[PDB]
From a paper:
To better understand the nature of the NTD–RdRP intra-molecular interface interactions and whether they regulate the RdRP fidelity, we designed point mutations at the Y471 and E472 sites in the context of the WT NS5B and the N- and C-terminal deletion mutants. Among these five structures, three of them (Y471A and two forms of C-672_Y471A) maintain the WT conformation with the NTD–RdRP intra-molecular interface maintained. The NTD–RdRP intra-molecular interactions are fully disrupted, and the NTD is rather involved in a non-intensive three-way interaction involving two symmetry-related neighboring NS5B molecules in the crystal lattice. These structural data together suggest that the selection of Y471-E472 mutation sites is valid in perturbing the NTD–RdRP interface, but the interface may not necessarily be fully disrupted by some of the mutations. 60-min and 180-min were chosen as representative time points for a comparison also including single-point alanine mutants (Y471A, E472A, and the N-91 form mutants). Consistent with the observation in the time course experiments, every mutant either lacking the NTD or bearing mutation(s) at residues Y471 and E472 showed much higher level of misincorporation than the WT did. The effect of E472A mutation was highly consistent with AA mutation (compare lanes 4/8/14/18 to 5/9/15/19), while the effect of Y471A mutation was slightly smaller than that of the E472A and AA mutations (compare lanes 3/7/13/17 to 4/8/14/18 and 5/9/15/19). Although NTD–RdRP disengagement, a situation mimicked by the crystallographic open conformation state in a crystal lattice or the N-91 construct in solution, results in fidelity reduction, engaged NTD–RdRP with perturbation from point mutations can achieve similar level of fidelity reduction.
Compared to the RdRPs of other Flaviviridae representatives such as the NS5 of the Japanese encephalitis virus (JEV) and dengue virus (DENV) in the Flavivirus genus and the NS5B of the hepatitis C virus (HCV) of the Hepacivirus genus, the pestivirus NS5B contains a unique ∼90-residue N-terminal domain (NTD) that does not have notable sequence homology to any other viral or host proteins. The global conformation of our CSFV NS5B structures is consistent with the recently reported CSFV structure with an RMSD value of 0.9 Å (95% coverage) between the reported structure and our representative C-682 structure. These structures together reveal that the NTD adopts a globular α/β fold with an α-β-α-β-β-α pattern. The NTD interacts with the palm of the RdRP core intra-molecularly with a mixture of hydrophobic and hydrogen bonding interactions. Collectively, these biochemical data indicated that the RNA synthesis fidelity of CSFV NS5B is fine-tuned by its NTD through the intra-molecular interactions with the RdRP palm.
Residue numbers in the entry: 13 to 89, 91 to 124, 132 to 273, 281 to 531, 538 to 670
Write the structure that this text describes.
Amino acid sequence: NLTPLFEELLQQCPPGGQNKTAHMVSAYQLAQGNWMPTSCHVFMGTISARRTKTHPYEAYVKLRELVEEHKMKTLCPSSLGKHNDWIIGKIKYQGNLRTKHMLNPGKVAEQHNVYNKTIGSVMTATGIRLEKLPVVRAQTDTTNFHQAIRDKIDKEENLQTPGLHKKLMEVFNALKRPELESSYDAVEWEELERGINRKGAAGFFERKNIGEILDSEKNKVEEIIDNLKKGRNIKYYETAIPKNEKRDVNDDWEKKPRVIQYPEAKTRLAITKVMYKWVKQKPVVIPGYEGKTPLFQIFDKVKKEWDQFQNPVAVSFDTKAWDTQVTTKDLELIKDIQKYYFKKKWHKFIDTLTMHMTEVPVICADGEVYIRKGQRGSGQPDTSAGNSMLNVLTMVYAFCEATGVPYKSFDRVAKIHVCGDDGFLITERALGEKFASKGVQILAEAGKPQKITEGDKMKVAYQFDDIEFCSHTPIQVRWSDNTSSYMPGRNTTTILAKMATRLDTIAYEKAVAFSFLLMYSWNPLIRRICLLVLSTELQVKPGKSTTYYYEGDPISAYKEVIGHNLFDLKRTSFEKLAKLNLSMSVLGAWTRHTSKRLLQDCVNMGVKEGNWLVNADRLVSSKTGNRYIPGEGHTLQ
């Protein structure tokens, strides 16, 4: 009966190893009674117990007792490493973070959401009620910023199963790429400068952004590389800022933590110049890594896998606050894998870098300092590559331990896909259901707790378009050549909000409209707003600040990456569209007039003489009698 109470308690339990010297009992056995727990250290959901005359509820209080006594004896222990001493010398005032689990040695000296006016007014012309759209890209004040630190970052490292990382290395060995062993070398400045945002933010003590350092202090970046190569400490620190702050800028081309934590600009450059081939995944060596896959391609790619199983399911990876769950032992596991691929001349570089990373001085925007114990910093060059690999290994381990499949046999029964901590695997229904039910506890013990579903089971998708990945979900479309394909779907209310606002001109907006058209042409509402915005001021070229932009004609650019003409899209999946439109009605962001007013405005523009983008919309052109004849055009990043 009280099996669920025990299963709840068993994920508070400290992870332990296998105990052959005693009886290991599960939550079922404890609930049955006549089992007396001798230790709260959990191993694969089992506890050491003693046969006795014990009623169930009494056994629960013993375990709960144990779990609390152990928690009392390990909640507030640490020395500062010598290489981090320098930060103490910059402290000027006493600290007020009030951290409980990490040192707040003090404070060093000190050092908006607006509308896209064209996109926004097209929406309003339609009767879309902007003030009813969800809030996106919200900023946070210093007070809630420091609370987020206290809430998420201020913690002890997760305890993990003894010998866990040995086993995760055994998984790695089952998927390494031996032809690449000990081959990675640094890259040239020219190759680095090709894929780099020159606006990459400066760190707390820095003044110049990435571009300015490139142009004028390349020797400072090389002094850092030289120090690390030789095993010598650098002054490593990360800067904390709240999400959507001015320095919340991406180095490379929503899921971010509330607390961005990033290395200096000179330092991000030192790491990338040496560790390029791994942090950029050139080539891809992490199985199922979708970091380079365009969002308009991913679900088509995944469906071909889905179609080869007999009764496929997909099991979602959903780790609570992943970056705060990364342990020193996790980072060293990634260090060891990096050393596998890199030439030996860079091993001491990787050792020293990783060492700096296990205890990181972090400086808040306002100057407060905390010493972070392990964990991942949002802004590190190795976030995507390091988190993806750690996610893959951990999930393959967990699936294999839950199902009994051997690590070397994973590739035979499942497909995995990851984008950092985000991912899922496809496998046969029986395997997937076993993993979903037993994964929660195994991954708790591995130090990667899940956001657990009703019933404490992992989320399982029994039909393809129930998969969740990168905040999107498959939705099918029907083309006029009698084929079907899949596009990245997402709630209309969310798409509208994202398209309608930015953080602090026409050329930008048309870059956005194009970008959104590439992802959301399955959504008639979004598609028609896009075409109206692209119809604005045809003489101004699109900006290049966003995900994509077009050279020449946007409609032809679309056809180049999507594989059909916009005008060939004849149907969007009726059921799924209804799901993704639901919130529009719940929130009252549209009315009964909104689709017809938007279509009418498109028709009014397209009936007139000339060559109008809006006539690339199959239904708009059907009502106007005119088509769009498109020029040349190409999509660019």
